[PDB]
Structure formats: structure tokens, C-alpha cells
Amino acid sequence: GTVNWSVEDIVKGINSNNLESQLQATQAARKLLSREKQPPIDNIIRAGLIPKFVSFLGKTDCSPIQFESAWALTNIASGTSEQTKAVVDGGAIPAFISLLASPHAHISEQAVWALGNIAGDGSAFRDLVIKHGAIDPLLALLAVPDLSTLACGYLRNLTWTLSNLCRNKNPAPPLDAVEQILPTLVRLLHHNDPEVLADSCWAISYLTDGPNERIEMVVKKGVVPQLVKLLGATELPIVTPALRAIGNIVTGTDEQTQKVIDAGALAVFPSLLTNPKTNIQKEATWTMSNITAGRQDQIQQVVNHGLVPFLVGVLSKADFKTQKEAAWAITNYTSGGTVEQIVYLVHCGIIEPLMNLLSAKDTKIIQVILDAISNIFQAAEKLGETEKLSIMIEECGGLDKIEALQRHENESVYKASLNLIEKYFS
């Protein structure tokens, strides 16, 4: 009967010289902290029960109290930064790392969960858990011939804790830690469980978010084909982190973007750029923007996959953030592409949505659209077709928009509109 205990009763039971009374009070505190409607985490912390739970973590001859205190500390460290800090101050990190090697599977899983929460608090606690040496037993827990023999929740919690170990920047995870975790991450990226796949993709996206050296560290393991395969999956919790990782990779060197292209990622984008989920569309358009900022052969590969009509459609009707990413994509396309590629972009119907988006209040998208229009005008000048494209701009009402932008607030906006009017509309 350890249900709905009072904090006073829990303190009275824990402070007793009875190990069984201590276990009963600890299970009561666990059931109290596992409740959904505002668990009194601060009330438990003020009572000074965290050191008692940390000490109970070490009672190897009493595994039930170990499991109960581990669950309680897990649910306490799952709260705010102050509560996780209070858990850490009690000396719980080395105790949980010691419990990682417990013969009882549930106690080891609880230690994994608690360490995952502590590392997910932030970068400082993540690096502190790494310094305490959790990576070695965490990876030893997965040194099995087939991951299918492990329990589902066990594998999921281990994958989530590993992902939290790769999470957060400023500072980024240590290079040695990332290199140690990466093979197990590549192995988890091929498991059949959807949650494990989603968390592994989240970890890969965390690792690829930063300098190109980290992106190369991830790419050298050859996970890009599997990343594209998971990008083609049907479960949105799997597609989202896969798309994030693909974008983070295409933010690097042109060789990494070419590695992404070689895996066949562009074939998935016809559905990604028309995904009913707004965030998926926005992230796909951002990835496309960074791909259009690459070499001319990469732009030609974008063209070959018929993604220019999809970019036009996203520019015409989508979320405003998706439309901003599309404008960035068109600007990168026109600035990096050949004159024939810009002519093809015009033939796909880019001028009408490019003009219709000039009525937005965001200044940055206005500058982006003006730069794109400028680049198309330079292409037409190289082709001697300035008059026809000027007629095109004037027919859809874009000339009126540029003339109204001539008297705009931002310096770049009005200087651009004036340049374009005086150079191609006189």
C-alpha cells in the first residue's frame, strides 16, 4: 500500500533504520514522482531525499530499493535544469554508471534512462557524464550479435540515451566520444524498430549539425544511402530526422552534397516538396536551397529530376517560411547556374510567383527576390533577351511592384529596385 503517500510519510520511512521501511518509502516516492498531474519534485528535493536515493542506488544486496531509487531519480532528473542539477549534485552519475553493469535488466535500463535525462539536460552535463565514463558500458550493453535478441524498450532507451550523448552544441560532443559512438550508431541505423530508427536519425542529425569536419566524420561511415532510404520511409517520426540530417550534410562541402545526390535523395523530393506536413516541406525546401547553391552539375542534376517545377509550385503556394526557403533556392540557382539553366528556370514559370512574392512585408525575402531577378536579367543580357523578359515582368504586374519598391525603407531594397528600373525599364 505505497499509493498516495505524503512527503512527510516518505521522509519518516526513509529516515528509519529499517531497510524494508526505506524500500516502502522509496517505492511510495517513486509512485508519487511518476504521476502526471504535477509531481512534487521540488517538495522531494527540499526534503533532502536525493542523497538518500543516491545511497540506495549502491545497495547491491537489495535490488528492489536500487530499482525504486533509480526510477525516482530518473523522474526527478527529467524535470527542469535545477532539478537535474540537484540530481547530479547528489553524486548520481557514477552510481548510475555503476548500475549500468547490474545483472538485473530493469535496473540497468533505469540507469540508462537516468543518464539519458542527465545528458539531455545540456552540454555541460553531457560532457560530465562522458567524463565519468558511461560510453564504455553503454556500448558494451549493445555488443550482441543480433540486436533483435534485446528487449524493445531496452534497445529504445539505449538508443535515446546515445542520441542525447550526441546532442547539443556550444560545445559540441567530443571528437573521441563521437568516433566511439559512431559504429554503434551505424549499426542501430539498420534496426527494424521505428523508434530506434527515429532516434538514431536524430543522433546523426545532431552529429551533422556543425562544421564540415563533423559532417565528414559522419559521412565516412557510409550512412548516406541508408539515410536516403529512411528519408523514403512512411513514418513521419523517421522522415523528419532523416531530412534534417540530409540537409545538415548538404550544408557542407560539394563532395558531401554529391555523396547525398549519388544515394538518390533527389528522387524523394517530389513527395517531400509536396508533403502535407508544413515542417517537412520547409526542411525539404531548405535542403533544395543548399543543393542549388552547389556546383553547376549538381544544379543540372536537380533539373534532371524535374525538381524545378516543384520549386516553382512551392514558390507559388506554400507556407511563408517554405516560400522564403524557395526564394533562397531560386537565388542560389540563378547565381550558380549557367545561362541555359536560368532560361529553363524561366520557362518553368518562375517569374509570376517571384513577382507575387514581392508583396511580402519581410525585407530579407524581398532582397533575395531582387537578387534573383537581377541574375535573370544578367542572363538575358548575355542572351540579348532583356526586352522579352522585361515584357514578361511588366505583364504579370511585377513592374509596378519594383516601381513601388523604389520608394522602400531598406537601403538595399530601394537601391536594387532603382538599379533594375533604370537598367531594364527605360
Binding site: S78, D121, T251, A293
Partner: peptide
């Protein structure tokens, strides 16, 4: 140019 947690056991 290119452009660039905690769970509770219930």
C-alpha cells in the same frame, strides 16, 4: 553560399 530531450517514466 550555403546556409546552416528528457523523458519521464509513467
Amino acid at each position: 553560399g550555403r546556409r546552416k530531450a528528457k523523458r519521464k517514466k509513467l
